[PDB]
């Protein structure tokens, strides 16, 4: 339990205060800050019961300390924390979709698949999702909202079966992205945010609808021709549609 306590006491000095400055200021301020942090953590440890409640109280104290040192942006005008959380969730979903599309592109360009056009299409879709995520991040930075990048989840299905299952998974992912965008629009409308919801419904929903329609057409073609019931249909759809 020594390494855990060391990590917990070394992460709080960075979570409370960002980075000092030797040349601009002095050095005694960071020392006083870390001394006060050690004092308060010792006082919380001496007045604790178990292990989880102490960690919860320490996290609450860190949050309360960060409540003051925020430094809001001067460009922030009419923006709620719920909208920020929704934008963060949308960014996480976009990153997950880009990761899934990259995995699909890297799964079809192998030797046991031999579908270069499918890999190129999946790579183009991943690039489009990456550009959309970057545009969302830039729009959030222009409004003044903070961006907290977290971990990116991995696809639950490493083996995408064949082509029809991959197309169905992509269609379900696009439907989930559309539902998330609709929820974001509803939250922005309920929280007085016409600019963000209008930009989302104008420069994002159209591409989502087009992608959903294209994936539906691809699924219909794979079901009518015969995939994955026959390798001829996949080859013909590779050499004709995406070719």
């Amino acid at each position: 339990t020594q390494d855990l306590r060391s990590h917990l006491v070394h992460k709080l000095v960075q979570a409370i205060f960002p980075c000092p400055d030797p040349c601009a200021l002095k050095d005694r301020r960071m020392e006083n800050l870390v001394a006060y942090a050690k004092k308060v953590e010792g006082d919380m440890y001496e007045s604790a019961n178990s292990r989880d409640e102490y960690y919860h109280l320490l996290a609450e104290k860190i949050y309360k300390i960060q409540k003051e040192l925020e430094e809001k942006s001067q460009v922030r005008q009419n923006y709620h924390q719920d909208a920020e959380a929704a934008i963060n969730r949308q960014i996480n979903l976009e990153l997950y979709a880009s990761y899934v599309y990259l995995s699909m592109s890297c799964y079809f360009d192998r030797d046991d698949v031999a579908l270069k056009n499918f890999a190129k299409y999946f790579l183009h879709q991943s690039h489009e999702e990456r550009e959309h995520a970057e545009k969302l991040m830039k729009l959030q930075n222009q409004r003044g909202g903070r961006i907290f990048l977290q971990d990116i989840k991995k696809p639950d299905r490493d083996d995408w079966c064949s082509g029809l299952n991959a197309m169905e998974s992509a269609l379900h992912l696009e439907k989930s992205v559309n539902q998330s965008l609709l929820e974001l629009h509803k939250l922005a409308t309920d929280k007085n945010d016409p600019h963000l919801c209008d930009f989302i419904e104008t420069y994002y929903l159209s591409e989502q609808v087009k992608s959903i329609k294209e994936l539906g057409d691809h699924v219909t073609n794979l079901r009518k021709m015969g995939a994955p019931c026959a390798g001829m249909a996949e080859y013909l759809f590779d050499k004709h549609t995406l070719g």
Partner: peptide, 19 residues
């Protein structure tokens, strides 16, 4: 309190790190 997502983030981090 729980008004910001960093609440749930730090809660999940502490639940995953500490047994």
């Amino acid at each position: 309190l729980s008004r910001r997502p960093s609440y749930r983030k730090i809660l999940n981090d502490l639940s995953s790190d500490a047994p």
